Every structure is written in C-alpha cells, then in structure tokens.
C-alpha cells in the first residue's frame, strides 16, 4: 500500500453511469487529503463529462473528501432524465450514395427517442469517413456535421450530410528497385487492374503479397492521393533480398523437447521467380532435413508448384524410422479460400516397430484441401481451419502394399462476451490396406500430446503388440474443447477436455480422456501454453504440457 480508493454513489442505481464515471475520473493514485481536495474540480468535471457522455445533462454532482488509511473521495451523482434524439438525418450523397457495401450509420443508438450516447455521432462520422477513405472518395466532404444539445427540454438533433464527390481509381503500377524479377511476374501478383475502383485494402493486399513472396527484404508500396476526376498512380519500390538468407530458431515442447530449426533459403534464382530452399530441424527424438524448389504459377502466391525431397530419423516410444521422400505438389486456391494441393509423393521407410524391423516403399498420389478463415495472424478474435488429405497406392505399381490413407482436421475459435474464448479441435485418421504389416509408422496413427490428447505423452496413445510395445493404430480420433477466461492483457486462463485414441477396430475405440487446466500467455512471437492435465483413463497421473505457436 497505499492507494486512495475512489467512491461513486449514484442515486438511484445505474451501473453504466457509475462505471463510466469511474473510467473518466481515473485512478486517484497515492494519497492525500490535500491532493484529493485539489483534484475535486477535476473529479466533478470528468464525472460530468461522463454524464454528458451518457445523455444526462441535468447532471448534478457533489464532491466529498474523507481521510484515513488510505484516503477516499466520495462523489455523489444525480442524473436528470436523459436527452433523447428528436431529429436524426444521416445522408451520404455523391457517388458513394450508390455503393453497395458502403455501410450507412445504423442501429438503436441513432434512432429517435434514444438517449444520446457519447460518440455515437462521432462513431457515425468516423464510419462514414473511414469507408469514404477505404473506397477512394478522396474528394469526399462533410457538407453538414451538426450535433445540437438542449439539455433543457431534453432534445438533441443529429445532422450528417456527406458529399463524397467523384471516386478516384487505380492508375499505373510501377516497379523500381534492384530486383531482377520480371515485371511479368510482379504484375501477376497485383490484386487489381488499372481503371479499377480504388481500395486501400487492395493496396495493403499488394504490399502483403510482395512481402510474402519472399523476394524482398523490403517493399515500399505507396499510393498517396492528389489534388482536385483523376487516377492515382501506384509506386512500388523493391529491395531485392540478400540472395541467400539464413535463419535459426530455438523452441521447446513437451512433445519433442528442446528443438532447433534452421533454414537457408534462396528467394529468387532467376527472373521468372523460381525459389530454392533448404531446411532442417533437430530434436532429441526427431531429426530431419529437407530441400525444395518452387515455381510460381498464377496467381504466384496462392498457386504454385513445389518439389521437395527429405530425410528424417525418428526414435519415439517403441518405434524407430529412417524415412526418405521425394515429391511434387501443385497448389491452387479458389476465391472461397479453398486451397487444393495435388501431389505425387514417393517414400521409402526403414523402420523398427517394437522388435520387428521392416522396410517398405510407396509411390502415392494424393489430393488435399485447406481452408483458413481468421480475424488475423497474431491472436485473432475468432476463426477456423479445415484440412482434408487423401493419398493412396496400388502394390506392384511402385508400392509394397495397397494403401488408402486419409487424414482430417478441424480447428475453431470464438470470442464472446467480454473476451471469453471457446476453442474446438477435432482430428481423424484412417488407413485402409490389404497388407497392414507392410505399413510403416508414417502411415500409421498415434495420439496423445500437446496438440492431440493432453494428459498423455506425445504419440503414446496407440495399440500394442504381444510384448507391450506401442506399434500404431489403423485409425485415430482426437478432439478437444477449451474455455479461455481473460485475466489480463496477454494473459488467459484455460480449462480443457481432450479425448482421443489410436486403435485398430472401429467397434472398440477405447477413447482415452484427459482433462485439465492451464495458462496462456501472448508473447510477440506467439501464444505459449502450459497445461496441467489429469488422465481419466489407463492409469492416469498428472502431466505438464508445454507448447508454442498460434492457437490455430
């Protein structure tokens, strides 16, 4: 201690007004009677601002200042009935009058008869000007912005007439900078054609496009407007990235432990925008190395070819595997957001399941679909992810066995009330075959872990053989529901239930259940999560899970 507690008395009770006054006055701070006495005129001023802000203008307040441990100041507030809107005229004229997606100011708070709330007028004004600016009505004017308050007789009039004038348009797109990327390529990632209606979110989209292309270390995408129609030219300057970039990352997980990730990427090999890359990751239970080549199709960023090769060693609970892979991928995304990937992958796997050593190889075609819909990036308000992937093989036809491998995931997040979050997770997997023994670990299914079924260690939920070794399931499911309570900014308190298992028979899934609670912390890289989970099934003890990365 000590800090001098603020006190608001509203007769008769009005929680809204009270909380507003409390927010407006702010913190009294530490001591004292005298300092509080000086603060009184400010306190009454702020309080009456808050009343005026909620429509109470025949607001009559009184300050009281008491001393003690700590001190305190009691404001008595009394609110004459509020000022209700009589006339409200909100008009958007000009070209904007005809724009479909131009939201007119609406809602309960701007209806006649309603108590005047702080900034509803300004909210409306801000909305109009924001959409004006988004859609390129730069010659857009407020012909009329009148707010009238007669506290007495309790009347308020709103008048917003907004002449938007003519709409500007996208001009030429120009590219300068030490980039060797052909303008043929750069123009196919401009998300607009010339003579098309201006949209600042399209400029943003272009900026993020160029940034995400990997081609540069910097882009200056600017389209400032011009005087009193025209056509706003867009200037893009590109700094070719250093031709060979290196990156190193450290991470940790309960699943795999300490982890190191490295990448050494060439972001442009030639003028046609081809991309080269290498990457590896080292952890005690798993080490892998990969190389890749990418060819932008059209659009370059959502449609592409990706060739890959890889080697991976893995020693987990009762299984070992050296896995070699080559592959070709074709990414294409439709306007929904549905990204398809058509693949042809060859794999050879040297493995030890329990004490039984195998080696098998498959050439499998596959098709996948993905969908990601979020509020944005670093933690979003609400969103979801859908993922579907099928691959298969015919023995004889470059396959040691017949295979129909299917895996699917669904992730979801919603925020409601004052920031209460709900998280949902489902994952399903299945492999069909006429030779299960020939099926290597990578094609089998495992469960448990930070991102699977908490309360259980990584990939430990699995069928066992004669001697009690975890060998892998033909199918698996893992689901989770989590509730998050905002405790502070960047701080949340979660409770969760996960259920899942990997198993060979649909009739006896023997689903295991872990339940628990943890802490979420929003760092700048991402949401770190630390959970304490109790296994309800098998012989359940307690388990600490730790993980890094986005919620979705």
Residues lying near ligand C8E in the complex (CB under 6 A) are found at: 384, 410, 412, 424-426, 477, 479, 481, 499-500, 511
Q: What would the two tokens of residue 421 be?
A: 């979050």
What per-residue string of b and e applies to 217-252 under the rule 16 or more CB within 10 Å gives b? eebebebeeeeeeeebebebbbebbeeeeeeeeebe
The residue count for the chain? 552
Q: Shortest approach of Mg ion to residue 299 CB, angstroms?
A: 18
- Answer with the entry of ligand C8E, Mg ion, none that 343 interacts with (C-beta below 5 to 8 A by kind): none
- Answer with the entry of Mg ion, ligand C8E, none that 425 interacts with (C-beta below 5 to 8 A by kind): ligand C8E
Q: How are strands ordered across the β-sheet holding 84-93?
A: 84-93, 155-163, 141-150
Q: Shortest approach of ligand C8E to residue 337 CB, angstroms?
A: 12
- Answer with the entry of ligand C8E, Mg ion, none that 276 interacts with (C-beta below 5 to 8 A by kind): none
Q: Shortest approach of Mg ion to residue 170 CB, angstroms?
A: 19
Q: Shortest approach of Mg ion to residue 225 CB, angstroms?
A: 25
Rounded to whole angstroms, how far apart are CA atoms 372 and 375? 10
**Which is closer to Mg ion, CB of 179 or CB of 499?**
179
**Which is closer to Mg ion, CB of 179 or CB of 343?**
179
State the number of binding residues for Mg ion (CB under 5 A). Answer: 2
14: left (phi over 0), alpha (psi -120 to 50) or beta: beta
- Answer with the entry of ligand C8E, Mg ion, none that 409 interacts with (C-beta below 5 to 8 A by kind): none
**Which is closer to ligand C8E, CB of 161 or CB of 410?**
410
> What x/- string results for residues 153 through 192 when contact with Mg ion is judged by CB under 5 A?
----------------------x---x-------------
Q: What are residue 160's DSSP bridge partners?
A: 90, 145
Query: 206: closest CA among 363, 346, 193?
Result: 193
**Which is closer to ligand C8E, CB of 292 or CB of 388?**
388
Query: 518: closest CA among 499, 487, 493?
Result: 493
**Which is closer to Mg ion, CB of 64 or CB of 272?**
272
Query: Contact at 8 Å (CB) between 355 and 467?
Result: yes
Q: Shortest approach of ligand C8E to residue 540 CB, angstroms?
A: 15
Map residue 21 onto helix, strand or coil: helix
Q: Shortest approach of ligand C8E to residue 373 CB, angstroms?
A: 8
Q: Shortest approach of Mg ion to residue 417 CB, angstroms?
A: 50
- Answer with the entry of Mg ion, ligand C8E, none that 436 interacts with (C-beta below 5 to 8 A by kind): none
- Answer with the entry of ligand C8E, Mg ion, none that 384 interacts with (C-beta below 5 to 8 A by kind): ligand C8E
- Answer with the entry of ligand C8E, Mg ion, none that 424 interacts with (C-beta below 5 to 8 A by kind): ligand C8E
538: left (phi over 0), alpha (psi -120 to 50) or beta: left
For CA atoms 176, 182, 183, 188, the dihedral sign is negative
**Which is closer to ligand C8E, CB of 259 or CB of 529?**
529
> Among all residues, whose Cβ is closest to ligand C8E?
479
**Which is closer to Mg ion, CB of 76 or CB of 220?**
220
Q: Shortest approach of Mg ion to residue 193 CB, angstroms?
A: 19
Query: 343: closest CA among 371, 363, 370?
Result: 363
Q: Shortest approach of ligand C8E to residue 511 CB, angstroms?
A: 4
**Which is closer to ligand C8E, CB of 354 or CB of 479?**
479
Q: Shortest approach of ligand C8E to residue 389 CB, angstroms?
A: 17
**Which is closer to ligand C8E, CB of 481 or CB of 530?**
481
Q: Shortest approach of ligand C8E to residue 331 CB, angstroms?
A: 22
Rounded to whole angstroms, how far apart are CA atoms 70 and 297? 69
Question: What secondary structure does DSSP assign to 512-545, as a single string?
Answer: EEEEEEEEEEE-SS-EEEEEEEEE-SSS--EEEE
For tokens 């892979």, name the residue. Answer: 325
Map residue 315 onto helix, strand or coil: strand
- Answer with the entry of ligand C8E, Mg ion, none that 410 interacts with (C-beta below 5 to 8 A by kind): ligand C8E
Rounded to whole angstroms, how far apart are CA atoms 485 and 478? 23
- Answer with the entry of Mg ion, ligand C8E, none that 175 interacts with (C-beta below 5 to 8 A by kind): Mg ion
- Answer with the entry of Mg ion, ligand C8E, none that 346 interacts with (C-beta below 5 to 8 A by kind): none
For CA atoms 181, 184, 188, 192, the dihedral sign is positive
Residue 116: CB partners within 8 Å, gap ≥ 6?
55, 82, 83, 84, 85, 149, 156
Query: 48: closest CA among 65, 60, 35, 32?
Result: 60
**Which is closer to Mg ion, CB of 185 or CB of 477?**
185
Neighbouring CB atoms inside 10 A of 36's CB total 22
Neighbouring CB atoms inside 10 A of 178's CB total 9
> Among all residues, whose Cβ is closest to Mg ion?
175
- Answer with the entry of Mg ion, ligand C8E, none that 549 interacts with (C-beta below 5 to 8 A by kind): none
- Answer with the entry of ligand C8E, Mg ion, none that 408 interacts with (C-beta below 5 to 8 A by kind): none
Query: Contact at 8 Å (CB) between 182 and 273?
Result: yes
Q: Shortest approach of ligand C8E to residue 412 CB, angstroms?
A: 3
**Which is closer to Mg ion, CB of 179 or CB of 209?**
179
Rounded to whole angstroms, how far apart are CA atoms 484 and 423? 8
**Which is closer to ligand C8E, CB of 147 or CB of 481?**
481
Rounded to whole angstroms, how far apart are CA atoms 309 and 325? 5
By the criterion CB under 5 A, which residues form the site for Mg ion?
175, 179
């Amino acid at each position: 201690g000590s800090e001098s507690q603020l006190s608001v008395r509203v007769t008769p009770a009005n929680a809204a007004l009270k909380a507003n006054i409390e927010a407006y006055v702010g913190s009294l701070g530490e001591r004292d009677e005298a300092a509080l006495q000086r603060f009184r005129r400010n306190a009454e001023a702020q309080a009456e601002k808050a009343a005026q802000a909620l429509g109470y203008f025949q607001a009559q307040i009184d300050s009281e200042v008491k001393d003690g441990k700590p001190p305190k100041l009691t404001l008595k507030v009394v609110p004459g009935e509020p000022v209700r809107l009589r006339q409200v005229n909100i008009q958007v004229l000009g070209e904007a009058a005809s724009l479909e997606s131009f939201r007119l100011p609406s809602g309960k708070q701007l209806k006649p008869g309603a108590k005047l709330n702080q900034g509803v007028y300004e909210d409306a004004k801000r909305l109009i000007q924001n959409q004006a600016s988004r859609y390129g009505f730069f010659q857009g004017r407020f012909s009329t912005q009148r707010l009238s308050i007669d506290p007495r007789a309790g009347i308020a009039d709103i008048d917003l007439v907004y002449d938007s004038g003519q709409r500007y348009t996208f001009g030429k797109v120009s590219f300068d900078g030490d980039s060797i990327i052909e303008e043929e390529l750069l123009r196919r990632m401009v998300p607009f054609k010339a003579g098309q209606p201006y949209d600042s979110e399209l400029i943003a989209e272009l900026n993020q496009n160029l940034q995400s292309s990997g081609y540069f270390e910097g882009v200056r995408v600017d389209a400032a407007p011009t005087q009193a129609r025209q056509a706003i030219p867009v200037a893009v300057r590109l700094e070719a990235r250093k031709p060979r970039t290196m990156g190193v990352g450290l991470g940790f997980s309960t699943d795999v432990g300490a982890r190191a990730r490295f990448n050494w990427t060439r972001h442009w090999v030639n003028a046609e925008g081809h991309s080269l890359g290498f990457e590896s990751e080292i952890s005690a239970p798993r080490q892998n190395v990969g190389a890749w080549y990418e060819i932008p199709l059209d659009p370059p960023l959502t449609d592409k070819l990706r060739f890959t090769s890889g080697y991976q060693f893995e020693d987990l609970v009762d299984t070992e595997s050296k896995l070699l892979t080559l592959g070709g991928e074709w990414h294409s995304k439709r306007p929904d957001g549905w990204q398809r990937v058509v693949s042809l992958n060859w794999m050879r796997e040297e493995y030890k399941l329990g004490d039984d050593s195998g080696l098998s190889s498959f050439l499998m075609p596959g098709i996948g679909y993905s969908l990601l819909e979020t509020d944005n990036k670093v933690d979003p308000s609400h969103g979801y992810r859908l993922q579907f992937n099928v691959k298969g093989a015919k023995e004889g036809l470059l396959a040691d066995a017949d295979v129909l491998h299917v895996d699917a995931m669904a992730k979801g997040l919603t925020s409601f009330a004052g920031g209460h979050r709900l998280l949902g997770r489902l994952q399903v997997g299945g492999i069909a075959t006429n030779d299960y023994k020939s099926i290597p670990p990578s094609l089998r299914f495992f469960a448990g872990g930070d991102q699977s079924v908490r309360g259980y260690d990584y990939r430990t939920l699995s069928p066992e053989n004669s001697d009690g070794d975890k060998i892998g399931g033909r199918y698996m499911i893992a689901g989770s529901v989590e509730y998050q309570y905002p405790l502070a900014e960047r701080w949340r308190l979660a409770t969760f239930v996960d259920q899942g298992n990997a198993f060979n028979s649909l009739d006896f899934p023997s689903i295991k259940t872990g339940v628990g609670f943890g802490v979420r912390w929003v760092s700048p890289v991402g949401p770190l999560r630390l959970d304490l989970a109790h296994a309800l099934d098998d012989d359940g003890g307690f388990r600490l899970h730790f993980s890094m990365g986005p919620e979705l």
